[PDB]
Design a protein around this nucleic acid. Structure first.
Ligand SMILES: [Mg+2]
Ligand SMILES: [Mg+2]
Lengths: 397, 393
DNA sequence: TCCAACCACCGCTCAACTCAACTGCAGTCT
DNA sequence: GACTGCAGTTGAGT
DNA sequence: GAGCGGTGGTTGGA
């Protein structure tokens, strides 16, 4: 589901997640909004030794990476109305602590994700696969990973470019494919079929699928048997077709998937994105209880990990004050960001995060000394414009 | 037929021809030797269609299959001393090009095949039916076919096990059945009754003759000893019966001379090198496998079997196998252990398609084939050991 | 007379393989 | 979920 | 050459 689909639509465009975030921020003058299917974690997350709760620990670092990218994420959870070891409660707790949004689909999350995109709530979808396209996604993302090392890239699929050849596969086309082929998921699918043949049926325009039904089935069946119109590579007489085909409690499951109410969509327009303020004291207590980051070493570990992303977040949110950036020392266009212009920024971690390791019991990295980080130039111009200008001025000299 | 013989002796054991070949090779430490009656081909190969000479083409592919099985075949042809649409000359020509042996019976091929087996020239007989048992065969094979696809299996009959119940049909038993059930054979008779006369010991017949005839004739009409299911006064028996010139057609069938048997004992199996250039010219002239495509076609089809022949004939040289990838015990071979070998077809066959006039399978790229582990251990032992030890890792 | 089981006999009917492309399976990592 | 070779099938031509 | 039902004939009994 759908097995062999990337042979037809393509594997997709590998692209820096940083580039997407910054390109969108430049074109639309606001941070990228992303719907993330919570199901993508199950196998990336588990397993990743060791220490205490390494599974949710990996989730923590992914969240910090989201902060540094300046993305407004909304995490969608599955609902009971469908036809690892990481607690949902803990996941949702960490989400809120990071100032992110948790959202519960009434049914399947991937359908809700696609729906949110269609309604303009989010700009793109990050999911397990491209099932989201069947539910109406236009820009869908998968495989958030290294390009190993740090997870910097995703694989982008565009529903409009896919529909424009060579597969000619659109939403209705893929629906027919799933309806005809596998089969191992949906009832009353065709035994000998078959993504190659199904895609050929879709390309022949059969993907309508406009609710009676009796006529369509026999035109399609006659074409399969005789290949008169030449819709297929060969004839297909041995391909006998179930009486429960086309199953239609399946059909709309795709064309009208159970998603949030219109009232819920309107609530989200007003309430998403949220204030997005990272709860520092909350994260300190969470990491202590969950990761055993206890005492002064645990506080310093938190500051080190959290300071860069928190720098980005406040830099975007705040839109005389070197309260964020102490200085700039270099410029680069690195391949990991697909040559996205970044500037080498210096900052004071402990001062930025706002925790004092002295208030913690004592049982190298000094959180009070300057630390360095690469931050996208675009983000820096928005938050610390005067600092960026001074650097630009010094470079002209 | 003998008609309805199989409901008496059993339908036979269906067995992988590969299993027979490899089992015999493991037990006797030399390839299986098989006598093949050329009469089997008549109503099997004329179902092929398309192309040039599809019947002799079918014969070609089965010859290639014989190479892959590592079997040493001797094809027996009929002779004139007996009491569609394939040329004998072309059949014999192709046989020699493959390094196989062609043998002319002085009379019926079946009798000669059985005789060859009795004399130790071959280990088993492949023929149309089971008549070979009457001529003295002990292990006889029939119906070399699919188990619907490639012809991997055969039906084995064992003369010893047949004679050991429940039919009790031995050689002289089946002779009596043949004598009685027509057709100077007895009208109204009768394999059920004939087989019952056999179990009553009447199959001897060791000659004068008049006493014997009047015992079963008295038993047929009275059933005193209970030899039969019922009485049989209906059956009246011809004066000529039992026909004696028929009896020794079975007990002493016209076959090759002792001198010929001795000739075969030292000449078979033969040197047996596949004539590559010969086959190239044959397939060009007969199948219209012309120019570079025809060369490539030959190389692809012939490379695997040719690999086996080298393997067994071996009995460092990576000139056969480039590597091993996997192990399997497939049902088509009756779980005969096979290894997935890689080889270069063109390099192995030894023909360059470049010397042919050109007009997607690349014969210079590695190709894969399943080859019986036993054969591989014999021909390329060092390669097999490297695979075995990398495995236990 | 007739049936019923058994049987010999008649008339009827059938008889491969390559090749490419494909689906589906079972590994596997995640 | 998706990738890889194997296996078995089908359709078309040999 | 072999598997299928039908046919007609023989045998021993109803
Ligand atoms: Mg999915
Ligand atoms: Mg015969």
């Amino acid at each position: 589901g759908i097995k062999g689909i990337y042979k037809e639509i393509g594997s997709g465009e590998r692209i820096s997640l940083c580039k997407l975030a910054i390109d969108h921020l430049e074109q639309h003058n606001r941070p990228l909004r992303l719907a993330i299917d919570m199901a993508i974690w199950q196998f990336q997350i588990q397993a990743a030794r060791g220490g205490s709760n390494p599974a949710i620990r990996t989730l923590f670092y992914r969240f910090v990476r989201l902060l540094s990218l300046g993305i407004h994420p909304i995490f969608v959870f599955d609902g009971p109305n469908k036809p690892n070891g990481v607690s949902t409660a803990m996941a949702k707790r960490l989400i809120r602590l990071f100032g992110f949004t948790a959202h519960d689909a009434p049914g399947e999350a991937e359908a809700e994700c696609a729906y949110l995109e269609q309604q303009g709530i989010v700009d793109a979808v990050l999911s397990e696969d491209v099932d989201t396209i069947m539910f109406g996604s236009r820009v869908t993302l998968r495989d958030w990973s290294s390009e190993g090392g740090p997870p910097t890239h995703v694989t982008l699929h565009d529903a409009k470019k896919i529909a424009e050849g060579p597969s000619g596969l659109d939403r209705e086309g893929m629906v027919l494919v799933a309806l005809m082929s596998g089969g191992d998921y949906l009832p009353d699918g065709i035994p000998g079929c078959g993504i190659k043949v199904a895609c050929q049926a879709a390309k022949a325009g059969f993907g309508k699928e406009l609710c009676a039904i009796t006529e369509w089935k026999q035109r399609l069946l006659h074409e399969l048997r005789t290949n008169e119109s030449g819709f297929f590579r060969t004839k297909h007489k041995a391909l006998e077709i179930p009486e429960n085909f086309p199953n239609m409690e399946v059909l709309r499951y795709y064309t009208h998937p159970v998603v949030s109410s219109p009232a819920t969509i309107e609530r989200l327009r007003q309430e998403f994105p949220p204030s997005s303020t990272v709860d520092i004291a909350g994260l300190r207590e969470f990491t202590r209880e969950t990761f055993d980051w206890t005492f002064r070493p645990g506080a310093i570990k938190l500051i080190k990990v959290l300071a860069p992303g928190l720098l980005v977040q406040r830099c975007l949110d705040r839109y005389e004050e070197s309260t964020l950036v102490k200085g700039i020392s270099m410029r680069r266009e690195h391949f990991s960001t697909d040559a996205t212009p970044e500037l080498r920024v210096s900052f004071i971690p402990a001062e930025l995060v706002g925790l004092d390791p002295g208030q913690e019991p004592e049982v190298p990295f000094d959180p009070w000394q300057p630390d360095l980080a690469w931050v996208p130039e675009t983000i820096l111009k928005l938050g610390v414009p005067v600092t960026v200008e001074d650097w630009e001025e010094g470079q002209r000299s």
